[PDB]
């Protein structure tokens, strides 16, 4: 179904993530962990305070795709278990919505106000993605049946 991941989306404010590489992602998935640069840092650690849900979705530069979305856990912190990314401030934990990925040419239709129009896919990493097309782009990846969102709602 649709219905937790809609309510998962209410309100949520969306974020363009942009990575250079696949295995940073990867690392990403596996650890549930996102690390950006400081202009960025400041922006999300905003948004986390400011929002019932803050997304993520990446997407790895060249791919043609984004490679799925996620939502932010935490305000970033140091410290931590160190992350041997492929190269940065604190680190974010992330509970992944979707790891399915979405190729560009189905996200045509969805135009971002936030970045004059264009279309979705465009946008330097830490672009915001206006409610309305950030909800419906994540409506149209896949729907990833290995999550149970169930536990991220409890975290709103």
């Not at 997407?59 to 996620?70: N, T």
């Not at 045509?108 to 970045?115: E, Q």
Request: aromatic residues 10%.
């Amino acid at each position: 179904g649709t219905s937790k991941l809609k309510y998962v989306l209410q309100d949520a404010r969306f974020f363009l993530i942009k990575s250079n590489n696949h295995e940073n992602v990867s690392l990403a998935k596996a650890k549930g962990v996102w690390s950006t640069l400081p202009v960025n840092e400041k922006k999300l650690n905003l948004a986390f305070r400011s929002a019932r849900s803050v997304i993520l979705i990446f997407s790895v530069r060249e791919s043609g795709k984004f490679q799925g979305f996620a939502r932010l856990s935490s305000e970033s912190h140091h410290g931590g278990s160190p992350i041997h990314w492929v190269l940065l401030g604190g680190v974010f934990k992330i509970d992944w919505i979707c790891r399915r990925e979405l190729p560009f040419t189905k996200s045509a239709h969805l135009t971002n106000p936030w970045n004059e129009h264009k279309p979705v896919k465009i946008g330097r990493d830490g672009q915001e993605i206006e409610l309305e097309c950030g909800t419906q782009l994540c409506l149209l990846f896949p729907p990833d049946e290995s999550i149970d969102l169930y536990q991220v709602i409890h975290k709103m």
